[PDB]
Design a protein around this ligand. Structure first.
Ligand SMILES: OC[C@H]1O[C@@H](O)[C@H](O)[C@@H](O)[C@H]1O
Length: 390
């Protein structure tokens, strides 16, 4: 199993595309397996994952862990990878293992890295403008009002990509309602008409007046650019996005704080911290060689190689002393590890059709964040949920 492999990739942005290419360079060197990467625009790759897997997919592919893995593993679209994990199993922890498995208990994913969803800011700006890190909702709101009166956009905000605003719902839910409630909702074991969801949208109505206007017309990269260019005070997203988008020259000025506490019952106990990894499509060619590349991917060595170029994510291997780490990465390890539990992200944690319904409903909330809209959102979400989860 040394013959050439094909690798489908959603790393279409410059910085993560380059990081992946560097991993494949090293993967070919050590395994001997020639690899040809086929890249597709990020969103359209996940938007067409079904036809992709059912058609003539590549030997291996970039994908996501948790429910977003299970949903397509359940369809028989993926080759199980228990043989690979027999070799690499000792390298990963229980949390990474359960995220890597289908509903059937079998492995389908090799994971590579983790990252946090947190509020990013520029240290020099907080310093020079006398902004203090906010521990609580009230302090957060006060700070955003101070930014506003300073002539700044308080929170840079983008939702043209559809998924980014799901992160705000997640974190509001996790802060107000907690983790167990959030996963219930994702599994539709609690309805979208539930008063806890109303509370989420109600909190968001206060937050919305400090979020960048025109957000439904904005790519997340342009939001991250406004932060990096100091036109905005902070931005809530994943480090995989914001810190990958920063110049390497500017990255040392980047820092974050976890989303402030709202409800003392849940403090800052929880966050979204997505794991990314790789699958082996059932209809891909050369599975023998592909597993050899996967076995390599699932090592500390490979994660270290990878993190010489990726400076924004955090490796998952147990022994990992990949000493490249900057301050963003170190704080990521610590703050993630502090959480009692970590969810993935809405579109990774629920049925894709349900996430797609929410993506649109939340865009419509962004444009008209009134109690009227919130009522329609809950009823529409709950109606579509009853169909999807039947
Ligand atoms: O950070 C969370 C996001 O991660 C992205 O890479 C993915 O395209 C989104 O669908 C969402 O899961």
């Amino acid at each position: 199993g040394n013959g050439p492999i094909t690798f489908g990739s959603n790393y279409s942005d410059e910085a993560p595309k380059a990081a992946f290419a560097s991993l494949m360079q090293q993967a070919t060197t050590s395994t001997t397996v020639p690899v040809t990467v086929n890249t597709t625009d990020h969103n359209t790759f996940q938007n067409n994952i079904s036809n992709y897997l059912q058609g003539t997919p590549d030997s291996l592919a970039t994908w996501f862990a948790g429910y977003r893995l299970q949903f397509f593993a359940a369809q028989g679209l993926l080759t199980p990878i228990d043989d690979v994990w027999d070799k690499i199993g000792g390298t990963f922890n229980d949390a990474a293992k359960s995220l890597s498995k289908g509903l059937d208990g079998h492995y389908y994913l090799v994971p590579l890295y983790n990252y946090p969803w947190v509020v990013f800011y520029n240290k020099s700006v907080f310093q020079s403008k006398g902004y203090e890190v906010p521990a609580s909702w009230e302090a957060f709101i006060a700070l955003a009002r101070k930014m506003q009166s300073d002539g700044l956009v308080p929170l840079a905000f983008a939702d043209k990509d559809g998924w980014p605003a799901l992160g705000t719902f997640d974190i509001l839910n996790l802060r107000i309602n907690g983790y167990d409630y959030h996963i219930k909702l994702m599994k539709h074991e609690v309805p979208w008409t539930d008063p806890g969801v109303t509370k989420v949208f109600d909190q968001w109505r206060e937050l919305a007046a400090y979020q960048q206007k025109g957000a439904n017309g904005r790519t997340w990269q342009d939001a991250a650019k406004a932060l990096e260019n100091k036109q905005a005070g902070m931005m809530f997203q994943g480090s995989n996005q914001v810190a990958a988008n920063y110049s390497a020259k500017n990255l040392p000025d980047l820092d974050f704080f976890v989303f402030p506490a709202i409800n003392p019952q849940y403090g800052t106990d929880y966050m979204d911290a997505p794991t990314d990894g790789f699958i082996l499509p059932k209809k891909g060619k050369n599975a023998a060689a592909a597993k050899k590349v996967l076995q390599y991917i699932g090592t500390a060595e490979a994660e270290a190689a990878f993190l010489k170029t990726d400076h924004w994510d955090v490796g998952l291997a147990n022994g990992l002393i990949a000493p490249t780490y900057n301050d963003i990465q170190k704080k990521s390890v610590a703050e993630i590890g502090k959480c009692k539990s970590v969810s993935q992200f809405m579109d990774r944690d629920t049925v894709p059709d349900m996430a797609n319904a929410m993506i649109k409903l939340i865009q419509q909330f962004i444009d008209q964040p009134t109690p009227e809209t919130i009522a329609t959102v809950q009823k529409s979400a709950e109606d579509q949920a009853k169909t999807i989860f039947r």
